[PDB]
Amino acid sequence: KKIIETQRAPGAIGPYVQGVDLGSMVFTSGQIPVCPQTGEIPADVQDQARLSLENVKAIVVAAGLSVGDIIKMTVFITDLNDFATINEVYKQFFDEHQATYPTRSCVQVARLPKDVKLEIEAIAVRS
Amino acid sequence: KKIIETQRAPGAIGPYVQGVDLGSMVFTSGQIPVCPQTGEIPADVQDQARLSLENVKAIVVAAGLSVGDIIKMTVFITDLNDFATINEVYKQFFDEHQATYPTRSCVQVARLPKDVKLEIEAIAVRS
Amino acid sequence: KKIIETQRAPGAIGPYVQGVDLGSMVFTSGQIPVCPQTGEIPADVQDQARLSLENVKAIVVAAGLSVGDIIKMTVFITDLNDFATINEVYKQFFDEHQATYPTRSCVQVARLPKDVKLEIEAIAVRS
Known part of the structure; x- marks a missing residue:
């Protein structure tokens, strides 16, 4: 276990914690569209989606992995x-990074922390 | 990793992608009760439950695993x-396959893709 | 693949099943605030939260792991x-066990089994 x-x-x-690195596999917390520099949440769902994904990318990268390692x-x-x-x-996010699409589940919940439109958790593997 | x-x-x-096989472990995407031969969703919740499970089964089997490997x-x-x-x-589905029940979480969300009544994701292990 | x-x-x-032990990793089922001895659900959410976490802990400890192995x-x-x-x-639960916080996702769903206020599932690692 490494934080x-x-x-x-x-x-x-x-x-x-933002992520945990088990060696073989990395887990992230559910990433919401909060901007890491300002704390702001963008109003537009397109911008929220992109920011949630960039937040996931940041954590996977900090573990020494990249978007293509998300499964x-x-x-x-x-x-x-x-x-x-x-x-x-x-x-577009995965295509940009020349990354195969991971497995996915998508469900509509009632509400999310900080009233955001989405929250994305990821699991990645070190190849 | 292998799609x-x-x-x-x-x-x-x-x-x-439908599933990913990491060698030791297989992940499926969340499976909804769409019939692969018709692209349609049966109205009855029993039929939907069985079809989501058959869809999970298909992916786990395609990986060379069995229902009994779902954990x-x-x-x-x-x-x-x-x-x-x-x-x-x-x-009944697990009983038919002589399979130990997996661990599980079950929650009521607000809405699911295509307005289905359930969506099921699975993790299976090889060894 | 021990139950x-x-x-x-x-x-x-x-x-x-309550949990599965894969050797490297333990998964729990989602735990609701039902008291294992009495079957009763405490009314206050502080008490429900503590109880769901104790229920998770019981399964992790039954597998031979600690709160600090939850990832x-x-x-x-x-x-x-x-x-x-x-x-x-x-x-306070993690702090009492001198355990660093795991990764986490949190979402508001529409409804939970037995009309409880929360349900918690966990993944822990051995070594």
Whole structure:
């Protein structure tokens, strides 16, 4: 067990760490669209989706991995009518990094911490 | 890592793959009750529960594993009033395969892709 | 692929086992605040949070692991108004065991089994 800590993803606002590196596998906390430098949450769902994904990227990178090493994500969201937009941002994010798409679950929950539109957790493997 | 692809479960409805095989462990994407031959969703919750499980099965089998290798599932549902009925179908499914019940979490979310009544993700192990 | 069974966590309310020990990793089922001795659910959310965490601990300890070996939790809750209270209980729980906080996801769902206010699942690692 090694704790992952990076200033490139928002600091924990609760009793959790950003990531844990087990050697073979890295787990992230659920990443919300909070900007790591300012603490702000962007209003637009496209911008939230991108920021949540960049926050996941920051943690995986801090472990010595990259987006292509992510093998499973869960995307908790507040509105499935956002699905198409979120998916386009998500596809572009992986495509940008020449990364195979991970396995995924996506469900619409009632509400999320800080009233964000999505929260994304990831599991990555060290090859 | 190796992508799992099978015609015996539905194709991806977003930027994800059906399953990933890490050697020691297989992850599936969350499986919804879409019939792979018709692209349609049965109305009855018993039929949906069984079909989501068959979709999970197809992916685990494509990886060279069996129902008995599944060790964790998460069952997202839209109505806990369906819990007892879902549980009966789920219990029978594992019983038919002479398989130990996996660990599980079951929660009622607000909404699921294509307005299905449940979505199930699985983790299986090889050795 | 050892099943974990302990009297210090409630018996299963559906077709699942309390925990599975894979050797390298232990998974628990989602634990709800049901008292393993009495079957009763405490009314106050501070008490529900402590009890769900004790139920998780019971399974992790039954496998021969410690609170400090927990590396990921997911906390499903029904009311974000309860979040600060849950976080305080959760923080104090890890602090009492001198355990660094695991990675975490937290989401507000619509409803949980037995109408409890939270459900917590855990993953722990050996060595």
